[PDB]
Design brief:
Order of helices and strands of chain B: EEEEEEEHEHEEEEEEHEEEEHEEEEHEE
CATH architecture of the largest domain in chain B: Beta Barrel
EC number (chain B): 3.4.23.39
Number of strands of chain B: 24
CATH class of the largest domain in chain B: Mainly Beta
Main location (chain B): membrane
Strand order of the largest sheet of chain B: 9-23-24-11-12-13-22-14-21
GO cellular component, one term (chain B): cytostome
Catalytic activity (chain B): Hydrolysis of the bonds linking certain hydrophobic residues in hemoglobin or globin. Also cleaves small molecules substrates such as Ala-Leu-Glu-Arg-Thr-Phe-|-Phe(NO2)-Ser-Phe-Pro-Thr
CATH topology of the largest domain in chain B: Cathepsin D, subunit A, domain 1
Helix content of chain B: under 10%
Number of helices of chain B: 5
Distance between the termini of chain B: 18 Å
CATH superfamily of the largest domain in chain B: Acid Proteases
Family (chain B): Belongs to the peptidase A1 family.
Structural class of chain B: mainly beta
Largest interface: A-B, 6 and 31 residues
Oligomer: heterodimer
Shape of chain B: globular
Number of domains of chain B: 2
């Protein structure tokens, strides 16, 4: 897996 | 103690969760506390998407403090998107409350299977303003303004499953959590909690690489080329097309990441990035590392890093502080 913001 | 302590709880011994509530009455919610995003979002009773069936949903109408809005939004993460609209209401973090602006998500379709597969309801961002949509002031930054906490900083002590829970202290640093001296690393930007460090694995070194201390990432992210060069002489097996790098957990070739500044030296040995996969094979492990190229050579120090290191994210000084976490509380 989880890669969390653009 | 002009500082909170939200007891965090382990999720599938990789990530972790912590609660918070919206609506002036309680309305409890489990969140993924994301130092890698700056937007609090929650599932509304208006949610129509299946992902919500398992979730705790929010009822504005059941809350005296609900200040409407309705500005449609789309929260994009590296792992998913979540749509809804802005709304305002109280937010009760730990025991402190404050009129906060968030997103009432109603479509969780682009965040699957993750969402339906996970136990959290929402994602509560603990990052910097410029990382937010709708330019919301950070909870902890707003709390300080609102003289509810003296120091605008938050601590993180990850729970170690069958050992101890962890804590999200808000407003101060508790020595109960860390061993050795804390070392501060100034931010290179007020966006994510991004500090600059020299990356060194085998004799592969990417000096002055961007380092994002992100709690919302379950893995240690790595610039693709770095990943590809790193896994060359080890006896690591990448399944074709899958970011599945299998190792014997005893592989004597496994490198020790080593980021350093002129203040301190931070390392993450195989013990912290490897993931046992005994069901698949006895004595087997997987790397828990991912190839991911940002615009500028970035590494993401996710849960595994923070799981070894007690971290301090300071809004006031603009720096992250790294100290070794206590094996147990």
């Amino acid at each position: 897996x989880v890669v969390x913001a653009x | 103690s002009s500082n909170d302590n939200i007891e965090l709880v382990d999720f599938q011994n990789i990530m972790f969760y912590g609660d918070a509530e919206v609506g002036d009455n309680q309305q409890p919610f489990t969140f993924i506390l994301d130092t890698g995003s700056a937007n609090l979002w929650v599932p509304s009773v208006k949610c129509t998407t299946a992902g919500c069936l398992t979730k705790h949903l929010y009822d504005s109408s059941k809350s005296r403090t609900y200040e409407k809005d309705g500005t449609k939004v789309e929260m994009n993460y590296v792992s998913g998107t979540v749509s809804g609209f802005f709304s305002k209401d109280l937010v009760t973090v730990g025991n402190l409350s404050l009129p906060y602006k968030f997103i009432e998500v109603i479509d969780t379709n682009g965040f699957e299977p993750t969402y339906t597969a996970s136990t959290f309801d929402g994602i509560l961002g603990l990052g910097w303003k410029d990382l937010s949509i709708g330019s919301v002031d950070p909870i902890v930054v707003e709390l300080k303004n609102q003289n509810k906490i003296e120091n605008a900083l938050f601590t993180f002590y990850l729970p170690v499953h069958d050992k101890h829970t962890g804590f999200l202290t808000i407003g101060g640093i508790e020595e109960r959590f860390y061993e050795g001296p804390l070392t501060y690393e100034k931010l290179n930007h007020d966006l994510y909690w991004q500090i600059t460090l020299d990356a060194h694995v085998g004799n592969i070194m990417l000096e002055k690489a961007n380092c994002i201390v992100d709690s919302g990432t379950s893995a240690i992210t790595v610039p693709t080329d770095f990943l590809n060069k790193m896994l060359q002489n080890l006896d690591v097996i990448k399944v074709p097309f899958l970011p599945f790098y299998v190792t014997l957990c005893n592989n004597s070739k496994l490198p020790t990441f080593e980021f350093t500044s002129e203040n301190g030296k931070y390392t993450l040995e195989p013990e912290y990035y490897l993931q046992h996969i005994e069901d698949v094979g006895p004595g087997l492990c997987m790397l828990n590392i991912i190839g991911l190229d940002f615009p500028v050579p970035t590494f993401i120090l996710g849960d595994p890093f923070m799981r070894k290191y007690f971290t301090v994210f300071d809004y006031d000084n603009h720096s992250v502080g790294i100290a070794l976490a206590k094996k147990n509380l």
